[PDB]
């Protein structure tokens, strides 16, 4: 099948070009809603944690598959293993409110506590990457720009605080994604990079 | 009916075959390039998600 | 002379495993093969049935 290259139009060639046969497809496992619906571990901090979806590591399954979208939307579920009592606080609230009990507080019950939180940001959609920073003093500019190219601060789902936090896992519901981005695999050094499959 | 995506070989024992690109002939085309891309097909399918931290 | 390696249902791992039991559902079977009993040495091989 010949065509013009520069035109940038999609073109697909089936196996019927040389006498073959085209079979049936089932693509349930690649849907965005399905694949992104599972728990992912996060390294927690002792007292105060800010629930932000960019804290999942970029190498895990959810982390990278999330990072191949420019804009997204989802609700949230968390599963926390703590001591004491756990208090949640909505987006954009003072940090003194982490001590008040009238805010949703879950009393300790072993082993863990699973919650469901809504989406409380003021924007219509969130973003994984943001072009706001518009980009002797050798180290000065290094550590100035390195901290001057993060995301805005209103891209979060709230905060939680407890006497001590030991585990913390995220789960996304009703995920939607816009405007795809690159996604790369581990670059082999030899002719192939092989996992050692289950075999004795 | 299905085939594996895993097993970085760095070894012997090919399983699924090879593909070979040849140059039959050419007229006054020394140094000119041929770029090549890849994409999925009509009936490509992918199953059984896993997490190996890559 | 073992079987191929893709004849399995997956794998499990834990800090320590103490017991493990299998249960099959919706079993289907094809092409029967031999099945043999314990060969007696005497005229009969007898289990000691429930009796005092």
């Amino acid at each position, epitope marked *: 099948t010949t065509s013009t290259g520069e035109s940038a139009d999609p073109v697909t060639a089936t196996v019927e070009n040389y006498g073959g046969e085209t079979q049936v497809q089932r693509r349930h496992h690649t849907d965005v809603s399905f694949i992104l619906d599972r728990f992912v571990k996060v390294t927690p901090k002792d007292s105060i944690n800010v629930l932000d979806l960019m804290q999942t590591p970029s190498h895990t399954l959810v982390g990278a598959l999330l990072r191949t979208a420019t804009y997204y939307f989802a609700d949230l579920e968390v599963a926390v293993k703590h001591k004491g009592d756990l208090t949640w606080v909505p987006n954009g609230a003072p940090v003194a409110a982490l001590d008040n009990t009238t805010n949703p507080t879950a009393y300790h019950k072993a082993p863990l506590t699973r919650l469901a939180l809504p989406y409380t940001a003021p924007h219509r959609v969130l973003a994984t990457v943001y072009n706001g920073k518009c980009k002797v003093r050798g180290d000065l500019q290094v550590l100035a720009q390195k901290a001057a190219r993060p995301l805005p601060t209103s891209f979060n789902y709230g905060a939680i605080k407890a006497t001590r936090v030991t585990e913390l896992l995220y789960r996304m519901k009703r995920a939607e994604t816009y405007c795809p981005r690159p996604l790369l695999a581990v670059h082999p050094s*030899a002719a192939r990079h*092989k*996992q*050692k*499959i*289950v*075999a*004795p | 009916d299905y085939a*594996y995506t*895993a*097993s*970085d070989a*760095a*070894e*012997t024992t090919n399983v699924q075959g090879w593909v070979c690109l040849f140059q039959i002939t050419h007229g006054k085309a020394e140094g000119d390039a041929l770029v090549v891309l890849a994409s999925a097909g009509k009936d490509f399918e992918l199953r059984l998600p896993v997490d190996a931290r890559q | 002379r*073992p079987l191929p*390696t*893709s004849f*399995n249902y*997956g*794998a499990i791992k834990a800090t320590r495993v103490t017991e493990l039991l299998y249960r099959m559902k919706r079993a289907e079977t094809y092409c029967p093969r031999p099945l043999l009993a314990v060969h007696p040495s005497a005229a009969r091989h007898k289990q000691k049935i429930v009796a005092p």
Partner: nanobody
Framework: VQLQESGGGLVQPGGSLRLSCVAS?????????????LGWYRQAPGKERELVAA???????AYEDSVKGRFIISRDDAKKMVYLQMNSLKPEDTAVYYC????????????????WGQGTQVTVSS
């Protein structure tokens, strides 16, 4: 992907050696396992490198009947290392030993299954 060894060099005949296999880690792929069959090869000057021994997945061990009964091999999978014991030292030990894996074909074990090794040499001459 490439196995290192240690414990060699220049040594006098009549000592006691335990060659050690400092593996790269054996990143080896999918759960299709229990084909873990390592081995040891020796190599002669200008003469084709010959086998010495081979270890099966759990417990079987064979050796070349030249060295049969004299050497002892065993693997420790809990930490994923394998070693080679060297007792009853003869002049025949002058060869470079390669810690590698086996193929276990119908006729005989085939070689790597790898890129290549570096090796450690034990040449003894009195």
């Amino acid at each position: 992907v490439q196995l290192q060894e240690s414990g060699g060099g220049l040594v006098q005949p009549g000592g006691s050696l335990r060659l050690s296999c400092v593996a790269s880690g054996t990143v080896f792929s999918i759960n299709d396992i229990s084909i873990n069959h390592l081995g040891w090869y020796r190599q002669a000057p200008g003469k084709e490198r010959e086998l010495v021994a081979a270890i099966t997945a759990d417990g079987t061990s064979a050796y070349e009947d030249s060295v049969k009964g004299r050497f002892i091999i065993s693997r420790d999978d809990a930490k994923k290392m394998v070693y080679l014991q060297m007792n009853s030292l003869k002049p025949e030990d002058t060869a470079v030993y390669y810690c590698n894996g086996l193929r276990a074909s119908n006729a005989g074990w085939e070689p790597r299954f790898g890129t290549w090794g570096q090796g450690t040499q034990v040449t003894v001459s009195s």
